Design an enzyme around this catalytic site. Structure first.
Site, PDB file in Angstrom:
ATOM      1  N   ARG A   5      -2.062  13.688  17.983  1.00 56.97           N
ATOM      2  CA  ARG A   5      -2.531  12.374  17.543  1.00 56.97           C
ATOM      3  C   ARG A   5      -3.876  12.049  18.170  1.00 56.97           C
ATOM      4  NH1 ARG A   5       0.133   8.903  14.044  1.00 56.97           N
ATOM      5  NH2 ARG A   5      -0.169   7.175  15.528  1.00 56.97           N
ATOM      6  N   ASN A  31      -7.991   9.575   5.027  1.00 48.78           N
ATOM      7  CA  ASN A  31      -8.209   9.996   6.400  1.00 48.78           C
ATOM      8  C   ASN A  31      -7.796  11.416   6.767  1.00 48.78           C
ATOM      9  OD1 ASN A  31      -5.478   9.301   6.443  1.00 48.78           O
ATOM     10  ND2 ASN A  31      -5.786   7.454   7.687  1.00 48.78           N
ATOM     11  N   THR A  56      -6.288   5.318  13.160  1.00 49.11           N
ATOM     12  CA  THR A  56      -6.128   4.989  11.740  1.00 49.11           C
ATOM     13  C   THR A  56      -7.432   4.870  10.963  1.00 49.11           C
ATOM     14  OG1 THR A  56      -4.049   3.849  12.196  1.00 49.11           O
ATOM     15  CG2 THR A  56      -5.118   3.362  10.098  1.00 49.11           C
ATOM     16  N   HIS A 100      -2.398  13.801   8.668  1.00 49.48           N
ATOM     17  CA  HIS A 100      -1.355  12.956   9.247  1.00 49.48           C
ATOM     18  C   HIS A 100      -0.597  13.762  10.292  1.00 49.48           C
ATOM     19  CE1 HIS A 100       2.722  11.190   9.623  1.00 49.48           C
ATOM     20  NE2 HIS A 100       3.071  12.462   9.535  1.00 49.48           N
ATOM     21  N   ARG A 137     -10.770  12.965  12.490  1.00 46.72           N
ATOM     22  CA  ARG A 137     -11.226  11.883  11.624  1.00 46.72           C
ATOM     23  C   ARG A 137     -12.572  11.348  12.081  1.00 46.72           C
ATOM     24  NH1 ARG A 137      -5.272  10.274  10.195  1.00 46.72           N
ATOM     25  NH2 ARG A 137      -5.341   8.420  11.529  1.00 46.72           N
ATOM     26  N   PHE A 145       0.821  -1.201   0.000  1.00 52.45           N
ATOM     27  CA  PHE A 145       0.000   0.000   0.000  1.00 52.45           C
ATOM     28  C   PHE A 145       0.860   1.258   0.000  1.00 52.45           C
ATOM     29  CE2 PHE A 145       0.616  -0.811   4.573  1.00 52.45           C
ATOM     30  CZ  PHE A 145       0.857   0.459   5.084  1.00 52.45           C
TER      31      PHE A 145
END
Lengths: 150, 150, 150, 150, 150, 150
Positions: A87, A114, A93, A117, A104, A59
């Protein structure tokens, strides 16, 4: 130290959906200080290094392809425990499993899209910042709101 | 043309008060597309040219002094009638006389600290953009939300 | 002077509809400083003096009756041109004719239930403050955000 | 009982950062009713009793010093399970570990400056209310929105 | 009378941009009561009658074509002076000339894609409601918040 | 599949409190697409089937009674993992134990008045949709924002 810094990048999907100001507003309200900011369309070179960690995974190619598919808003925020804090504010994730309230959790539905980052560690943050920004592009003297730290 | 562009700058007071994301969010929601973005501390040189229009006035020096006193977030937005539109969204020179709903109307109280500046004309916009941004820093191909223009 | 002050009162209908925090948030964001604050159920005595100006009008009785019918949140805000500014943010007498963005424009529909009142002048403000608050209930030394005034 | 009450205090840092209306707005939206409200600068006497629980700890002095360093907005809210509910909405001791969505999670970064305090129990709530408010300052008859309780 | 009603329709562009809840939220906060609500893709027949007023104009065809190009959210709101009030909240024909605070002022940029339509008169409202809704689809007994009208 | 669908119903208390637009806005922002929407006052017949699962419990009658006591806004949203996602965004059975950020966590206080209901499974969703909506009332061809799914 309250001088910790982290790297945040709003991916092309976040930009395309008009979520940049909303995302920056969240970290501003939290009390973190913007030390670096810029929009750009990343080169494959920059993209491959940024995602170096997944280069052995299949990926990996999809990641590199997408990040370079459109404009990205790169930012650096400073503050106490900002790496871990950022975070938590982003979520996990899988956007569908992220809690309402997190970025998210409020705006995402697919792992492959998403929105944003954030560095997962101080070491990672240190690396990513020097990757995306030139030292002259970062604020040298920083001063948070005086009512933030005791 | 829907390709019109304007220059917007969140002054040091807007940045210091954590209003960057909130300001960007307003133009994003309106449907305008971010074509350029970056934070920086302007040099006296850049500041003097930017305010060239008031150079014969005594308050010119105060302007130049303040804009270079801290970080500034420079941006370029694209869209139909964006120059005039952006000004309407900002409000008027005196924040106290600006209507609730506009940026200065909602967040400002002093002329000398009116949060943000927007080009007052296409010609002025053209000049300011080339002043603050290098061509390579601007998005070349732009595509607004498909539901914005008929 | 940036030390001007005005009296604002969220009427029983504003309180009942849960609009207190929302209203305070607007003046906080504008940059005005809260110098006095308290919830209370006004006595007829206080109510009659507050509305003294309409005592010759038949609707005077209705005013006095309603203001004393439930809790009222009384506040004093300080800042440059706050008296006129606060009124602009409130809107006009008829909530239906008030512009979207203003308090009554966003939340009101009836003149007899227009959510909030603000002094219409410095002299009126001076009078109302001494009417609703005791000097010891007001902040003596006030300091707005340092990025608000030049 | 839906008549439970809790004591909430926005510390000097919360007030200084203009978060009062935003904080009140959260509890209003939740459906809790404001029974008491006032801004004040606490005396050392009041501060020492309020923090009595930490008096054997060295950080006790820092607490007392800060709370009395500026204006504090004291409030009393009424409703079912409000004590535990208010704490959940506030977050945890460390603002950095508080979840996005909670007050400290959205606005705080330091334990020593965690914006707001809420009673941790009914007994504690009972004590704090009688500490900060006089009975005459509290609403006697309270009536929440009719669509809140079955 | 506080029983006045108006017809509001979020056009396909408003729906596509995810502005339905945001739009409904504005009228809810104002105090108006939702009497009818439904999403649908209008037939040419319904579209031609709705725009009957512009049938002699060449842009009439473009109107009919677009409204039937996707889902439309049709609504009926009740309240005092709601017809004129709803129009003020929407803004003016040209979204770029609409004031910040109004729906089109905050979210629109093109006349041909101006997000929402509202009846311009009581007579027009009466006609449009019977056009889009069947009597059985409308709330019969309506009761606004008790703190809205005196 | 990104074509999963769930049934959401804002109960009479949610409607009465003016939370419809706010609730729809949350799912719109998440990226889910509205496939069905309508306000109505449910019949006992519809109410009994909807709550069939609790028919052996004594509180079943209270449920049926309340849902039919006023207008209900029924909706169908489409998207990847929407059934589980919608439930997470709603919170848990007890609004007081729901996390800030979730709908009930932000606006509810009583189990008997918990604002909104969402299907707890795909099978349940399938059943409820056919219960509240006729096939012709649902959007056939659906297209989410192009930046939502990879």
């Amino acid at each position: 130290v309250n001088k910790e810094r982290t790297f945040l990048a709003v991916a092309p999907d976040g930009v395309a959906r008009g979520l940049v100001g909303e995302i920056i507003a969240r970290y501003e309200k939290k009390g973190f200080v913007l030390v670096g900011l810029k929009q750009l369309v990343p080169t494959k070179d920059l993209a491959e290094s940024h995602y170096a960690e997944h280069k052995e995974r299949p990926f990996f190619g999809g990641l590199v392809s997408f990040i370079t598919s459109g404009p990205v808003v790169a930012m650096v925020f400073e503050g106490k425990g900002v790496v871990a804090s950022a975070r938590l504010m982003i979520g996990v994730t899988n956007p569908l499993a992220s809690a309402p309230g997190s970025i998210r959790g409020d705006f995402g539905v697919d792992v492959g899209r998403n929105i944003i980052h954030g560095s997962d560690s101080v070491e990672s943050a240190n690396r990513e910042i020097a990757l995306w920004f030139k030292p002259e592009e970062l604020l040298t003297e920083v001063k948070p709101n005086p009512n933030l730290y005791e």
